[PDB]
């Protein structure tokens, strides 16, 4: 179930693989979960001692994972205690090519491997049932940015309680301050 | 006068503006689904379609192209989609 | 009306007056 790029499975992703194994034994998600695999898992803190789960999955099977998102979210929240699980693909940040680097650059880095592209794709992957319909960057008096995300209002009833976890996850694995908002109209 | 929030325009003003000149541009057209009067099949037609749209099974003209919005055949039923 | 010489002098003098006034105001902030 877990195929790490470092191929050192820890007990966290071991328990996650056991959990998806238990779901593939029993639930209706049998024609999907058997073929699919994950790569890593992580358990972080958000909202004053609230644990949240980040499941790092491979990119090209990501869309298949996108088809079965909310069922796995609900069943893994039933399996564990009061928690929150988000599905974020494993992306590689290639460093910016400066004029001092190793001679492996016989070919340019693709644009999808940059910092901003991967960060925006992570923000896209983090909130699946809602869709990012707008984005603002408020630049404060200190010189510090604050990203505000306008989401789809049709799916607010599933993600209205996860916005704190979304902000905490994005701060943990990005370092940028993000607030989530629902517009009154489109 | 000289005192308004440009960051938060109301729906009536942002609707009223030109489609490029809004805060964030957005189209005025839409995709709509059409039932032929002589059948039951669903056809997804652009509102501002430039091609004459034939039914895939009945070959009846659903819409005729005009300068702007497409002119549906009388008898056809249409619904706004998404 | 009046020659442009003293209009230029008056404009540059009033401009230096705003420069001095804003200098004293910004010095007062420390």
């Amino acid at each position: 179930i877990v195929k790490p790029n470092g191929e050192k499975p820890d007990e966290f992703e071991s328990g996650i693989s056991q959990a998806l194994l238990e779901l593939e034994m029993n639930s209706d998600l049998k024609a999907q979960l058997r073929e699919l695999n994950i790569t890593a898992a992580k358990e972080i803190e958000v909202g004053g001692g609230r644990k949240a789960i980040i499941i790092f999955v491979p990119v090209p099977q990501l869309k298949s994972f996108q088809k079965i998102q909310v069922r796995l979210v609900r069943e893994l929240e039933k399996k564990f205690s009061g928690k929150h699980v988000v599905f974020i693909a494993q992306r590689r940040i290639l460093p910016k090519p400066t004029r001092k680097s190793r001679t492996k650059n016989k070919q340019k880095r693709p644009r999808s491997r940059t910092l901003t592209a991967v960060h925006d794709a992570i923000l896209e992957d983090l909130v699946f049932p809602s869709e990012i319909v707008g984005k603002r960057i408020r630049v404060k008096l200190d010189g510090s940015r604050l990203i505000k995300v306008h989401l789809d209002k049709a799916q607010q009833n599933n993600v209205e309680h996860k916005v704190e976890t979304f902000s905490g996850v994005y701060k943990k694995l990005t370092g940028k301050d993000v607030n989530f908002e629902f517009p009154e109209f489109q | 006068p000289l005192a308004k929030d440009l960051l938060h325009p109301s729906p009536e003003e942002e609707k009223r503006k030109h489609k490029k000149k809004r805060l964030v541009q957005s189209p005025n057209s839409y995709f709509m689904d059409v039932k032929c009067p002589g059948c039951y099949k669903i056809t997804t037609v652009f509102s501002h379609a430039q091609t004459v749209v034939l039914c895939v099974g009945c070959s009846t003209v659903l819409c005729q192209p005009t300068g702007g919005k497409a002119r549906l055949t009388e008898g056809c039923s249409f619904r706004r989609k998404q | 009306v009046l020659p442009k010489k003293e209009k230029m002098k008056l404009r540059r003098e009033q401009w230096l007056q705003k420069i001095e006034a804003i200098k004293l105001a910004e010095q007062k902030h420390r």
């Binding site: - | 997804t44 652009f46 379609a49 989609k81 | -």
Partner: protein, 149 residues
């Protein structure tokens, strides 16, 4: 403003912010690509392919669904012409205007507009020579103009 006209019009297409495929579209990427292949085998310019796919099948943006634009999709399979479609349409228009001029010698307006057209041809040919689409020995000549169409 216009490259040869004194007009300055705003009218164009405006793409929405949502790059995601809508939920109501049940067509997969390969089905859309197969439609593109059969439309190109019918003999259609990528512009015509995009218009037909937008109108009849409901595919709003081919790049948003398939991931590639129409010319690249046709190029990977190999169903793409040697000279690009805008240059083709310009050369076809120049051939038509030159035919009208050889039949009608008094039309100095037609001469002026033909000069406009073949100047547009020269600019587009310079661009395509710079980015290696046309061979460097390619040159637009008046008698060879109908031979390209």
């Amino acid at each position: 403003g216009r490259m040869h006209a004194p007009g300055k019009g705003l009218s164009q297409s405006a793409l929405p912010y949502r790059r995601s495929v809508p939920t109501w579209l049940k067509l997969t990427s390969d089905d859309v690509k197969e439609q593109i292949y059969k439309l190109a085998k019918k003999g259609l310019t990528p512009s015509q392919i995009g218009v037909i796919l937008r109108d009849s099948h409901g595919v709003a943006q081919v790049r948003f669904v398939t991931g590639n634009k129409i010319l690249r999709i046709l190029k990977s399979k190999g169903l793409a012409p040697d000279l690009p479609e805008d240059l083709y349409h310009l050369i076809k228009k120049a051939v038509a205007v030159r035919k009208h001029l050889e039949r009608n010698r008094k039309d100095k307006d037609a001469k002026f507009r033909l000069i406009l057209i073949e100047s547009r041809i020269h600019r587009l040919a310079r661009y395509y020579k710079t980015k290696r689409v046309l061979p460097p020995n390619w040159k637009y000549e008046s008698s060879t103009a109908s031979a390209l169409v």
